[PDB]
């Protein structure tokens, strides 16, 4: 089916690959040579996890666990039912991002429109890479990677953050939890003002975006305006999520003691490191 | 190659605007000025600020809590202001042992904090007070009102609720850089890896939802700002080709689609639930479960 | 440029071939694109840890 | 209350997480519901109603309230039909649904696809005040303040091509904001040109969507001071229509 | 009863078909994952008791 | 008669009896199935 | 039956064709992964095992 | 005499032939590809 | 049979050669890393 | 004429009949790879 | 005597014999499934 | 009641159908899994007790 | 009273009739998860206490 | 006071009502599992005591 407004819409081109070959909908979905790909690669990781599931011996789905090879394989390509399943599971999940950032590409040039959202799609993916590939690969093994369970990879950023004592001691990781904090407020706040905007008080008519530049100038004394909050949110996303990525990379490849002593630079300065008194003597 | 729309080419700039009237006194609006910093994302103007009764409370309320902690941390330093730079971030203002439960503690020994948070509880309640009736006098929705409240529920139930049900203002955070995020991670160690809460996923789930959200919705405004996407009021009373566009885009990349008005009831409330269920989270902890990994064990998402 | 259509009225059969290796040879250039990326991101990364400090090999395991 | 069940296992985090569970069932009805209020019924590729509607009804109609006394039904016929385009210059493709739609004609001309426009109502936006919102900076008393002043640069296309100087900047007055440019052709004429599909460059302001020949056809403004919220849509769907034509 | 035909009537066969051909894949991987999660009835593992191939 | 798909009544007949062969097929070789996994490892 | 055929009539033969591919070629390769991931049937394990060289 | 796809009735049944020659084709290869497994290594 | 060329008549050669080239690379890409799997038969 | 590509069907015959030729000398030099890495290296 | 559908009175008795004719054939066979349950493993 | 046909008068058919069939699909999957989940009546157990499969 | 039929002048049918199957429907799994969970309820833990199961 | 009726001239009876039945359903499912928390007002557990289920 078609929404009301559409069919002026579904008109050809704008395809990276293939033509005309794949340029049609299934349903609401547009396929492309990338959308054929992702369901494939999709479907694939999708029954690796159940037959994953099947090898486990357990059907909960809140205990299926598929673990990486052990820390001692390095990097190779380990046996399928020691690690390797995680593997060829992590290979189709790379396979369906980068195919639905590129089939989000496509859509972008069939509608004529920017390319903001793959671009913000691919600072995730960068986000997981980084989390499965390149600090595994830095660390010299792929069994640093997390596994693919919905409680057992909680249970190894639980224990990668205790690898470092107190991970909240990490400064990237301070600067991305507040970035993310800082998001959600203003994912608040948006919604709230064009809501209020949208739906006034009982017998009063729509109110303008005058009204809601009034509103948070006089609630704080400044209005970011529609564009600069749209703008700003995107960033503070995208801000976020690559200083989580940072704080990853930075944690046991350079740094591998306590962030919580690393922070004792400034206190151990000499030339009032021995004043007594204070917290730290 | 082609303009990204995220900093303004140019800029232009007239008389300030002192907002609109409505039923607002205009007395209590300061002065606006401009700053051109502040002109290439967003708005150059640090436009009239309402003062009124409300604004004034929570000030002086929040800057007597900011006052009195800083006042303990000049205590904690010993007039020294070398002192005070080389441990700022860790000075602590605790609250009152266990011993004292929720009496009022000597100075020395937990009063300072109980003076503190009492006075910057008056403030947010101010504050609230004041979200609410600015956004009456404008004639607007009140919703900025109960997007607050649950952030408020979540600071409330840290502080208050869950120090009076555990009968000790002991258990509650202390005021400190370093010192809170120590409460922070005994919390979780004292009661069993946090992580099995089943609020606590959910407030992380809400947490990153609202940050996926917000990259969607960005990235699909400046996507279609080719046609004016940003003012979305008026594309919701006379719709353009904008929100047609976005809609299409993401139906045809996820099979379903939101409109210009309804895209801000997923945003509020995505961001409403983390503080929501972080709330009720932690109200359970200590209070009906004190060990979480045990309790997931019990209900089937632990191993055993 | 690398993608061309085939004159098929007016077409030798040995210009048929070639366009039909050509064709191929740059659908196999697509799909090295994406394995070229990988294995130069999995290889670049594990170089990078091999010039990384000692310490770096000698984390825990996090299971 | 810890250890304290009311039946089994259940205890006040089972009844909690359970209530939460039913709440955002709810909630995601009520959510999915609210965002039915555009493009519904649906209908097939023929533009008749579509046999499958889908789970989700359509909502009881809301109404918005303008300042001028003019009501809005969003989910009504006559919103649907005030913003429906006919005499679309479009062909199928195939006889099954889920195919693309050939333009007859020239697209760009015709406004489908990438160019396709909205019949928005022929009125200009305008603020809390009743005064238009987009005006030329010659009827106001800004000034720039910052960035590059394009106004006397010359215009080159994507062809590598002048064809003409911008005189004149358009802009958002209760946002402070610049929205169009208005360039004079050679030929005379008068164009407005979105400012977020341009880069303006030290000596130069380059608009790479569009080639020279497709400059002289942009659409129109009836009023030389004043711009209609269709002529906004016409115009940038046009200009953005030249990325694929 | 003979006029089952009319849900015709009331469903489009291409979706019905699409639906029904999704539901049969998943429940028939869905059944023979299930049984060869369970050593007792994995054919495998049957097998490779019975021929001794470890 | 009645018709939200559009489709007359003896199209659907005929496209009934089709899918009822095809249902009848599938439902066959179902049954031949069961019964060679009930004969080499029954599961009552 | 005879008259399957008309399930041409019913589907667009493209969009079917490629479903079928896709579905065929994961489908080997599923089966192929799961007998790979059991040792017995495994068969460059097997012929490890039986030539002797690792 | 419905037809979604616009196909006639002798160009379905010319397209189904040539499908069924194909699936033929496929599953006789399959077969041969079973009986040497089950000859090589019975799973039975 | 015969009657395989008519599949040029269902899709366009080009696209589909380009296709082919790449399911052709990929799947020979997959099956050298399954082979380095298993050391009897990793060259490297 | 059922043709969903712009070909003919002669077109298509000699396509076919070049698009089979390569495909059989792909085919050749991918047996006598695998009769190399069989005489090299058994996995039967 | 109202319709939000729009069917007429005739046309929802015809569909009710329909929807209760399949509704007795799943009940049926429910009832079946029980009683062959109940005699193979009761829970009484 | 012989009037109850007057249903298909204040509810559209189409998902009527369509949310009685997924919710009979849900509800017989339910019932399974509860039983799948009791030793006592989960009929793989049984059989391998029975017929000693393992 | 005997005027109740006056509540479908005030809500429309369809939505009453949908929130109340909902509910029933809620209600009757709650009452049946809150019997199984008590031993001595649980039908099934009865029979097979009862016929002598596992 | 006979002029309470007057309420339905200041609050919409739809939102009156819908608020009212979940109100009461909320307080009335909180009362009940209240007293199946307290073992001397538990109904299951004084029928089991008294006919000697568990
Ligand atoms: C980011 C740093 C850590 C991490 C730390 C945490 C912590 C800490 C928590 C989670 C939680 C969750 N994480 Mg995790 N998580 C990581 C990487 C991942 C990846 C990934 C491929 O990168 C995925 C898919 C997930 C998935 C999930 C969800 C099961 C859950 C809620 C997330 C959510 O709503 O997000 C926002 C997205 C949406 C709102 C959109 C909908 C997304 C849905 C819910 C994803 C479902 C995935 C499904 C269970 C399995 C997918 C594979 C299937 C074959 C389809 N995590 C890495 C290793 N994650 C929380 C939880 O409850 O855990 C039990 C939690 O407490
Ligand atoms: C070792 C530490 C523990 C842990 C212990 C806790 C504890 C303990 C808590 C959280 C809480 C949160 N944690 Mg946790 N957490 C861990 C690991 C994680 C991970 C991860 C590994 O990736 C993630 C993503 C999270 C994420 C989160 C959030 C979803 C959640 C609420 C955040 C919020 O809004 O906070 C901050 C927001 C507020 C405090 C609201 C403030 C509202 C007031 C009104 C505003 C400020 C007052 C006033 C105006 C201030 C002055 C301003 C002036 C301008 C100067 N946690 C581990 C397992 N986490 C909280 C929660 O809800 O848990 C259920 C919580 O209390
Ligand atoms: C600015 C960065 C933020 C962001 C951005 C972002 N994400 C995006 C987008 C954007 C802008 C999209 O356009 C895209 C989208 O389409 O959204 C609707 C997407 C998206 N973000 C998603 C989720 C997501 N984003 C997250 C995070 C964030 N995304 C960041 C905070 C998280 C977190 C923190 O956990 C999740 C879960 C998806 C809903 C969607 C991409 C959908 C997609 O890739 O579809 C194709 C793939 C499948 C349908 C399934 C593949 C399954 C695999 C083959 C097997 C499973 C492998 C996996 C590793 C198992 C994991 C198990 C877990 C327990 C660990
Ligand atoms: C949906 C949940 C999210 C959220 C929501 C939210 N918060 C909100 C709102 C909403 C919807 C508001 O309406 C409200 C607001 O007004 O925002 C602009 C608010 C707000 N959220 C705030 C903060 C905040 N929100 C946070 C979190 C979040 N809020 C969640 C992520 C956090 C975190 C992560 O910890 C913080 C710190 C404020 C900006 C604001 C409420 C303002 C307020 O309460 O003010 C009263 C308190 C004070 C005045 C304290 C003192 C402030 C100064 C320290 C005083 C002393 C200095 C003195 C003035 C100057 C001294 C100079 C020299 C002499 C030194
Ligand atoms: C103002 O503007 C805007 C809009 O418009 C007005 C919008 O709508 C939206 C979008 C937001 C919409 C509701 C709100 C909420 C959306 C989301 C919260 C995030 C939750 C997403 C959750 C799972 C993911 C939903 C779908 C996911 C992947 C996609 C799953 C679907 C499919 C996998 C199958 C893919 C099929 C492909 C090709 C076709 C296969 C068929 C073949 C042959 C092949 C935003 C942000 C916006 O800002
Ligand atoms: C697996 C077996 C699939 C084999 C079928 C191969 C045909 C190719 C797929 C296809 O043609 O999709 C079209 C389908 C029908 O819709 P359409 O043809 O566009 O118009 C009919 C509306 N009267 O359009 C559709 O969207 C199908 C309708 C989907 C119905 C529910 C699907 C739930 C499961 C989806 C998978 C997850
Ligand atoms: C576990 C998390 C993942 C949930 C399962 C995957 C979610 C996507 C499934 C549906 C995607 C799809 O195929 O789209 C088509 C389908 C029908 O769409 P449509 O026909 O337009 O519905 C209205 C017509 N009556 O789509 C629909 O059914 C329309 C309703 C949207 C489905 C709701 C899914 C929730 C998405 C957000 C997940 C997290 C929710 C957090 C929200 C908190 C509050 C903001
Ligand atoms: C995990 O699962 C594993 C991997 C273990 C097993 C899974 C396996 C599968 C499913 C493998 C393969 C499935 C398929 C379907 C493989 C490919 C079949 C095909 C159809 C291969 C096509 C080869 C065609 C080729 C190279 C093209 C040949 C055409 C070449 C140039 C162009 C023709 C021009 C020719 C001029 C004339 C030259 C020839 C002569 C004799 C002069
Ligand atoms: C733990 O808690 C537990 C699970 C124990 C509690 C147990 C709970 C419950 C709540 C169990 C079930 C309650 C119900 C409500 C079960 C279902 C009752 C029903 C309503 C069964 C319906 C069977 C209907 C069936 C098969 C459909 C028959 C219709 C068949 C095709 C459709 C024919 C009608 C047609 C085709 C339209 C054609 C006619 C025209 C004129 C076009
Ligand atoms: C946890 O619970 C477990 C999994 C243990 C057990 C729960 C189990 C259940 C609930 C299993 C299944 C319930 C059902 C209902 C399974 C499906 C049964 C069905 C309904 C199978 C239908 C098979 C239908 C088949 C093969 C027919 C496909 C039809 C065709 C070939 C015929 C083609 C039709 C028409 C071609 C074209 C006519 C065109 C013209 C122009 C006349
Ligand atoms: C572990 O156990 C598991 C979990 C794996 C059990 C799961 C099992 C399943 C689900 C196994 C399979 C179910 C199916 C459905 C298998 C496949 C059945 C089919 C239907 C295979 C079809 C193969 C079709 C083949 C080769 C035909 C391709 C057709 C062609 C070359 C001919 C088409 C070209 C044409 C017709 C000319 C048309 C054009 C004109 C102008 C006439
Ligand atoms: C030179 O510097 C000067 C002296 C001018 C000022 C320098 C100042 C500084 C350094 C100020 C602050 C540093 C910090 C570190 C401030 C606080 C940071 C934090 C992290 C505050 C966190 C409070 C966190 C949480 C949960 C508190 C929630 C608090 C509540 C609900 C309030 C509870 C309200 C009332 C308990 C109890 C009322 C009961 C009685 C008996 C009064
Ligand atoms: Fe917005």
Redesign the interface.
């Known amino acids: 089916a078609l929404l009301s407004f559409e069919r002026k819409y579904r008109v050809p081109g704008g395809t990276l690959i293939g033509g005309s070959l794949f340029d049609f909908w299934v349903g609401p979905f547009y396929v492309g040579f990338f959308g054929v790909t992702t369901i494939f690669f999709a479907t694939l990781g999708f029954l690796l996890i159940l037959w994953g599931a099947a090898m486990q011996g357990t059907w909960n789905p809140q205990l299926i666990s598929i673990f990486p090879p052990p820390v001692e394989n390095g990097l190779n390509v380990a046996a399928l039912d020691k690690g390797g399943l995680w593997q060829v599971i992590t290979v189709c999940a790379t396979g369906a991002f980068c195919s639905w950032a590129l089939r989000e590409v496509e859509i972008c040039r069939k509608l004529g429109i920017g390319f903001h959202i793959p671009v913000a799609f691919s600072m995730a993916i960068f986000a997981y890479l980084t989390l499965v590939v390149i600090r595994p690969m830095m660390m010299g093994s792929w069994g640093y990677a997390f596994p693919y369970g919905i409680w057992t990879h909680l249970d190894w950023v639980s224990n990668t953050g205790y690898t470092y004592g107190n991970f909240h001691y990490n400064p990237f990781h301070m600067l991305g939890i507040s970035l993310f904090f800082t998001t959600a407020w203003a994912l608040a706040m948006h919604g709230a003002l064009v809501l209020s905007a949208a739906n006034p008080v009982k017998g009063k008519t729509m109110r303008t975006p005058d009204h809601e530049d009034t509103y948070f100038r006089d609630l704080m004394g400044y209005s970011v305006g529609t564009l600069g909050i749209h703008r700003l949110g995107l960033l503070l996303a995208l801000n976020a999520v690559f200083w989580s990525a940072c704080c990853m990379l930075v944690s046991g490849t350079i740094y591998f003691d306590l962030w919580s002593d690393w922070w004792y630079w400034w206190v151990n300065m000499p030339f009032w490191a021995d004043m007594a008194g204070g917290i730290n003597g | 190659?082609?303009?990204?729309?995220?900093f303004?080419?140019?800029?232009?700039?007239?008389?300030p605007?002192m907002?609109?009237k409505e039923d607002?006194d205009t007395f209590e609006?300061?002065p606006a000025g401009?700053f051109?910093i502040?002109?290439?994302?967003?708005?150059?103007?640090?436009?009239?600020?309402?003062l009124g009764i409300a604004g004034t409370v929570s000030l002086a309320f929040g800057a007597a809590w900011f006052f009195t902690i800083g006042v303990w941390y000049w205590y904690?330093?010993?007039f020294?202001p070398?002192?005070?730079?080389?441990?700022l971030?860790?000075?602590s203002l605790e609250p009152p042992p266990a011993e004292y439960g929720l009496a009022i503690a000597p100075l020395k020994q937990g009063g300072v904090w109980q003076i503190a948070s009492l006075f910057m509880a008056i403030s947010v309640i101010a504050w609230w007070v004041?979200?609410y009736t600015?956004?009456?006098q404008?004639?607007?929705?009140?919703?900025?009102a109960?997007?607050f409240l649950?952030?408020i529920w979540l600071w409330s139930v840290l502080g208050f609720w869950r120090p009076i049900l555990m009968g000790s203002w002991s258990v509650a955070p202390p005021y400190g850089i370093?010192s809170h995020?120590?409460w922070?991670?005994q919390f979780s160690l004292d009661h069993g890896?946090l992580?099995?809460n089943?609020?606590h996923?959910?407030s992380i789930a809400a947490?990153y939802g609202?940050?996926?959200?917000?990259?969607?919705?960005?990235?699909?405004?400046?996507?279609?700002?080719?046609?004016?996407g940003?003012?979305?009021?008026?594309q919701?009373?006379?719709?353009?080709?904008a929100?047609?566009?976005?809609?299409?885009?993401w139906?045809?990349?996820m099979?379903?689609?939101?409109?210009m008005?309804?895209?801000?009831?997923?945003?509020?409330?995505?961001?409403?639930m983390?503080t929501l269920?972080g709330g009720?989270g932690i109200l359970?902890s200590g209070?009906?479960?004190?060990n979480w990994y045990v309790?997931?064990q019990?209900?089937?998402?632990?191993?055993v | 440029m690398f993608d061309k259509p085939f004159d098929y009225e007016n077409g030798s059969k040995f210009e048929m071939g070639i366009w039909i290796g050509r064709q191929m040879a740059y659908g196999a250039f697509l799909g090295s694109i994406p394995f070229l990326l990988g294995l130069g991101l999995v290889l670049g990364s594990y170089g990078l840890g091999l010039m990384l400090p000692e310490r770096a090999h000698q984390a825990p395991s996090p299971y | 209350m810890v250890g304290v069940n009311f039946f089994g296992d259940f205890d006040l985090a089972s009844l909690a997480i359970w209530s939460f569970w039913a709440f955002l069932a709810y909630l995601i009805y009520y959510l999915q519901t609210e965002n039915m209020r555009e493009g519904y019924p649906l209908e097939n590729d023929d533009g008749k109603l579509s046999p499958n509607q889908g789970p989700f009804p359509v909502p009881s109609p809301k109404t918005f309230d303008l300042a001028d006394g003019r009501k809005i039904v969003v989910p009504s016929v006559e919103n649907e039909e005030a913003h429906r385009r006919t005499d679309l210059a479009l062909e199928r493709t195939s006889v099954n649904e889920g195919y693309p739609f050939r333009p007859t004609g020239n697209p760009m001309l015709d406004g489908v696809g990438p160019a396709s426009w909205v019949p928005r109502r022929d009125e200009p936006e305008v603020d809390a005040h009743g005064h238009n919102k987009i005006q030329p900076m010659r009827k106001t008393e800004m000034k720039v303040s910052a960035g590059r002043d394009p106004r006397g640069m010359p215009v080159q296309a994507g062809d590598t091509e002048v064809v003409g100087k911008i005189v004149d900047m358009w802009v958002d007055i209760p946002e402070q904001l610049v929205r169009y440019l208005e360039v004079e052709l050679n030929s005379g004429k008068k164009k407005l040109l979105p400012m977020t599909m341009l880069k303006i460059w030290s000596d130069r302001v380059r608009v790479n969507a569009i080639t020279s020949d497709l400059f002289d056809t942009i659409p129109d403004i009836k009023s030389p001071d004043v711009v209609t919220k269709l002529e906004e849509d016409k115009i940038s769907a046009y200009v953005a229509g030249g990325y694929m034509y | 009863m003979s006029k089952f035909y009319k849900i015709w009537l009331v469903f489009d066969p291409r979706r019905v078909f699409v639906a029904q051909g999704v539901f049969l894949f998943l429940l028939a991987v869905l059944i023979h994952l299930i049984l060869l999660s369970t050593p007792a009835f994995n054919w495998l593992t049957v097998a490779t008791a019975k021929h001794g191939y470890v | 008669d009645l018709s939200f798909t559009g489709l007359t009544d003896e199209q659907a007949q005929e496209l009934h009896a089709v899918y009822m062969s095809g249902l009848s097929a599938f439902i066959a070789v179902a049954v031949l199935a069961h019964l060679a996994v009930m004969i080499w490892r029954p599961w009552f």
């Open positions: 190659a082609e303009y990204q729309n995220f303004n080419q140019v800029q232009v700039a007239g008389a605007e907002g609109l607002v609006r300061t401009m051109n502040l002109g290439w994302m967003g708005n150059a103007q640090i436009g009239p600020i309402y904690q330093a010993g020294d070398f002192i005070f730079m080389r441990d971030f860790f000075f004041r979200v600015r956004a009456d404008l004639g607007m929705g009140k919703h900025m109960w997007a649950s952030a370093f995020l120590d922070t991670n890896n992580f099995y089943p609020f996923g959910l947490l609202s940050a996926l959200l917000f990259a969607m919705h960005g990235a699909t405004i400046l996507a279609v700002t080719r046609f004016g940003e003012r979305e009021l008026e919701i009373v006379d719709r353009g080709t929100s047609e566009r976005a809609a299409l885009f139906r045809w990349t099979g379903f689609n939101a409109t008005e309804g895209i801000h009831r997923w945003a509020i409330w995505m961001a409403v983390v269920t009720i359970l209070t009906v479960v004190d309790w997931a019990v209900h089937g998402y632990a191993p």
